[PDB]
Structure formats: C-alpha cells, structure tokens
Design a protein around this ligand. Structure first.
Ligand SMILES: [Ca+2]
Ligand SMILES: [Zn+2]
Lengths: 259, 125
C-alpha cells in the first residue's frame, strides 16, 4: 500500500503524547531525494518464442530459375503495464520516469521500455497498442522446385519486480491537542519515525536521513522481430533433384528492440 | 566440431486431468530437411500412453561443415488420444519452425491451448 508520512506522524503523536487531535506541517527543511527505481534483474529468464503465422508457397514448374517476391503483413496488438505496489506519500509529488533495457537469457536481443512511477499511488497503468509488421524479400526459385516462405514473429514476455526507493531528511512540525487545548508542539524527523516504527519500509540511515524502500513492477509482451523462413524442396519432375534447404532472412526489429 | 545438443520439449493440451498423453514424434534438422532426426518419439498406446508434460534429451550433432550451429528447424506429428474416436492434435507435421539456440519455437495444434514448444542449447562434445 502507500505509507502516508502524515498519517503515521498522526499516529505517533497520539500514542506518545495522548493527543486526540493532531496537526502536522512539513518543515521547509523537508526533502525527498535520490529517487531511484531499479529492476531486480535485467535478464528475462524466459526465452523468446518463434511463432509461425502464415506461409506463402511458390512452385516453379519450369526449367529456368524465377525471381519471386513474397510479402507479408501482420498486425500485433500488444501490452505494457506498470504500478507501484508499496509506496510513500510525503508532502510533495514523488515520481520517476524510468527506462529499462532488458535482455533475454541465452540470447542477443535487447528491449527498451520506460514507465512512470508515482510513489504515492498503487493505481496501475496499462497501454495496449497495435503494430503492423510488414516484410518482403525476393527469392530465386530454382527450376523444378517449390519454395515455402513462412512468416515468423518472435515474441517476448517479461514480468520484472522493481525497487521503488528514495531518501528523506528533515522534519514535520507537529501540534497535538487534547480536551480543547494544545498540549504539544514538537518537531519529528522521518528518521525518528523510522526508529519508532520499523514496519513502514523506512530505515534510519544516520545523519538524519531516512531511506524509503518500496516496490512495484514493469511487465509486457510484444513482438520482438519478424523472420522470413524459406524452405526449397524439389518438385517430383526434378529427377536430377534440387537439394532441399531451409534458410532464414531477417525481416524487421521492433522500434524498441536492438542487438 | 560435434556438439551435445539438449532439447527441452513441453507439451500442452487444455483439459483438466494432470498432464497430456502425447504420442507421435518430433524431429529436427539443421539446414537440409531430408537430414532430420528424432528428438522425441512415443508410439500410440491409447489409454496406456505415458503422461508427459516436459521431456528432456541430449543428442550428439554436427553440421555440414562442422561449423557452429546457428539454426535448427523442428516439426512434429503429435497427438492426443481419441477420447471417443478423433484425436487431439498438438502439432502437424507440415509445419516447420526454426530458431537460433536460445530462442524457443512453438508448433501449433488444432486449438490455441493444444501445442508444443521446444528449446535447445549446445556445448562442444
Ligand atoms: Ca482437442
Ligand atoms: Zn509497442
């Protein structure tokens, strides 16, 4: 959930002083800094998957080579989702645009994805968008041979926990009241709060600095790249017989994908 | 150079009782479709066909030139047992899908939740 600094100061004041009504104000010394969202790992441990979509077959039943253009189109609909699952609300906005570079174990492709982490909410944000892959290549079909050109889309999916972290220094000015009267007017650090209650994802790091260690995620599934996979096989009329072969032609990389 | 090639195959068929009971074969080849080889085989024993959700196998292999292997192509004739008569299909052998090592392939069946996937890796033998 979200640790509300003020509500927890409210609770501290009531417990410590017996106040029944509390009013706090962030001191102008109050600061949030070293905001940092970091992925717990960076190698997706699930391999990308090649999916075959359709194939285009061309039979060259003649005695001369032919050139043939095969063209494919595919529209993939795909999703990205991020959220903070353990956060903090201080007096000012705390957020980070983070960009992540993920690799895949056992291979060589890299994907780039970015998300906005607002530390003060658990609201989740998802974008679903379509992408139109289009690819074509010109193949030479030997005589008495057919070709099967299969369009392959290489899919990747990822679900990565991230650390949602910052430091805080400074104090709140707190007024406690009981039975129609002000009974307390004290300053309380966020470090002091961390010493008081160790169950708030805050730790006293010394020098008056409290560190917040919360969490969230970045998750997604997209096409990473298209491949045209070409198989030549002899037709029955071949006789001399063409030699069967499968070779692969790179189609396209996704915009956010690199090697 | 000869390589130890380790294939990890997973079988899927939506239908609630433990794992599927695949029978048939799956084969691979490097670049020449006539030089294919089985990486998995199970004869149709109907009701006695073994439960199999994941299958692992290591095979020694090499290319035409003994160069490193960049490519492998897979296909399968993989079925599930005729509860009544007509078998579930997890893979059709007309469908060939290739990948580099580290990329996994899917062979599609007759439904979105019936299919097979294959992952492979290589180390010098
Ligand atoms: Ca079925
Ligand atoms: Zn996209």
């Amino acid at each position: 959930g979200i640790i509300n600094i003020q509500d927890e100061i409210n609770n501290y004041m009531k417990e410590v002083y017996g106040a029944t009504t509390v009013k706090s104000t962030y001191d102008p010394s109050f600061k949030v800094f070293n905001e940092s969202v970091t992925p717990q790992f960076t190698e997706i441990p699930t391999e990308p998957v090649n999916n075959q979509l359709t194939t285009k077959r061309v039979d060259n039943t003649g005695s001369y080579p032919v050139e043939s253009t095969v063209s494919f189109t595919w529209t993939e609909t795909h999703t990205e989702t991020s959220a903070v699952t353990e956060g903090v609300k201080a007096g000012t906005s705390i957020s980070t645009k983070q960009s992540f570079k993920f690799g895949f174990v056992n291979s060589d492709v890299t994907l780039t994805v970015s998300a906005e982490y607002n530390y003060s909410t658990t609201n989740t944000t998802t974008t679903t968008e379509t992408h139109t892959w289009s690819d074509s290549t010109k193949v030479t079909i030997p005589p008495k041979t057919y070709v099967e050109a299969a369009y392959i889309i290489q899919n990747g999916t990822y679900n990565v926990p991230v650390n949602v972290e910052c430091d805080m220094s400074g104090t709140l000015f707190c007024r406690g009241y009981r039975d129609g009267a002000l009974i307390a007017a004290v300053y309380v650090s966020v470090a002091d709060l961390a010493d008081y209650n160790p169950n708030l994802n805050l730790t006293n790091k010394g020098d008056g600095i409290a560190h917040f260690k919360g969490s969230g995620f970045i998750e997604g599934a997209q096409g990473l790249r298209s491949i045209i996979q070409v198989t030549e096989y002899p037709l029955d009329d071949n006789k001399g017989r063409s030699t069967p072969i499968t070779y692969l032609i790179n189609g396209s990389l996704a915009p956010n994908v690199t090697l | 150079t000869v390589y130890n090639a380790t294939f990890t195959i997973n079988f899927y068929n939506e239908g609630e009782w433990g794992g599927p009971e695949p029978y048939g074969y799956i084969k691979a080849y490097l670049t020449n479709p006539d030089h294919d080889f089985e990486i998995w085989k199970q004869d149709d024993w109907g009701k006695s066909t073994p439960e199999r959700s994941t299958y692992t196998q290591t095979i020694k292999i090499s290319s035409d030139t003994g160069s490193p292997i960049n490519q492998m192509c897979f296909y399968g004739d993989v079925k599930e047992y005729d509860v009544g008569n007509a078998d579930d299909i997890l893979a059709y052998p007309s469908q060939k899908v290739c990948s580099t090592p580290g990329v996994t392939v899917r062979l599609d069946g007759d439904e979105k939740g019936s299919y097979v996937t294959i992952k492979y890796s290589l180390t010098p033998a």
